[PDB]
């Protein structure tokens, strides 16, 4: 029964084999800090805040550890999340190399004016002034996305 | 709810075309019809999303809020464009062979079972018309 509806036999095996690497003490539980390396081992590359969202999904925010059922529920939910906000959040995370949730104002200027339906200097000037929320030269884009919603 | 004076009067007229009795209410079985009257082509899943964020009628104020949210979100466009990344010649088709390679090697990698299922559902010589596959998953 459990998870037979949402995951395939083969996925449950893959996720087991990846989660199990960080169960040092055979608890059936990993240190939360390790969720990033688990997901990197699946060939994913999430950001700090992407990871907080995953821990959040299963009400495990600021928990020290993650269960295997928790983990299976995070993955099964994320694999099918076509939510508009998430899509905008995952487009911004493309240009966040280190995954810390900031993009330099200069790096944001560059992508916005050189890629896609290229913004004009006017258009991106407006953007940085609203997007550089603190003024430090760092765009906390996750927060900028809160505003635009 | 950052709609303009003009959008609000446009939605009010559209809402009242289906408010027969004039009681500021339309049925959810008519939500699709009003949105199509406003020149929209809402997806079956766009409409369930909306018809479900209300646990069977809609008052004008919860309509205006749906319409304001639907403006602020263009699913048909974005999926088409995600596919267009892997469509070089720009013809709106992609080989069953390149599509399989991309789905089993990039992103939240599809299993060989999941893609075998994807390709069957994409008709056709063995070239996938992805604009119609957008229609399928709506």
């Amino acid at each position: 029964e459990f998870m037979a509806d949402q995951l395939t036999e083969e996925q449950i095996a893959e996720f087991k084999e990846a989660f199990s690497l960080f169960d040092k003490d055979g608890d059936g539980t990993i240190t939360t800090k390790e969720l990033g390396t688990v997901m990197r081992s699946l060939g994913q590359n999430p950001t700090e805040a992407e990871l907080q969202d995953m821990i959040n999904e299963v009400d495990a925010d600021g928990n020290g550890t993650i269960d295997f059922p928790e983990f299976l529920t995070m993955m099964a939910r994320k694999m099918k999340d076509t939510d508009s906000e998430e899509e905008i959040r995952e487009a911004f995370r493309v240009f966040d190399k280190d995954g810390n949730g900031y993009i330099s104002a200069a790096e944001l200027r560059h992508v916005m004016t050189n890629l896609g339906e290229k913004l004009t200097d006017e258009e991106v000037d407006e953007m940085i002034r609203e997007a550089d929320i603190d003024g430090d030269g760092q765009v906390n884009y996750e927060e900028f996305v809160q505003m635009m919603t | 709810d950052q709609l303009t004076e003009e959008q609000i009067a446009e939605f009010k007229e559209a809402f009242s075309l289906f408010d027969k009795d004039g009681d500021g209410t339309i049925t959810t079985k008519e939500l699709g019809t009003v949105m199509r009257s406003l020149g929209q082509n809402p997806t079956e899943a766009e409409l369930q999303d909306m018809i479900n964020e209300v646990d069977g009628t809609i008052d004008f104020p919860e309509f205006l809020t749906m319409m304001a949210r639907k403006m602020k979100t263009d699913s048909e466009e974005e999926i088409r464009e995600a596919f267009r990344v892997f469509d070089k010649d720009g013809n709106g088709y992609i080989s069953a062979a390149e599509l399989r390679h991309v789905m089993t090697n990039l992103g939240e990698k599809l299993t060989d079972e999941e893609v075998d299922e994807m390709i069957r559902e994409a008709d056709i010589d063995g070239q996938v018309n992805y604009e119609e596959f957008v229609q399928m998953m709506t």
Binding site: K80 | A45, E78, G107, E108, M137
Partner: peptide
């Protein structure tokens, strides 16, 4: 690279959302 991964994931989320309703 990051852009191709993103394009492929968005397609996969919708494809899997579609199969979940069936």
């Amino acid at each position: 690279g990051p852009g191709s991964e993103f394009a492929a994931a968005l397609i996969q989320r919708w494809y899997r959302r579609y199969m979940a309703r069936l």
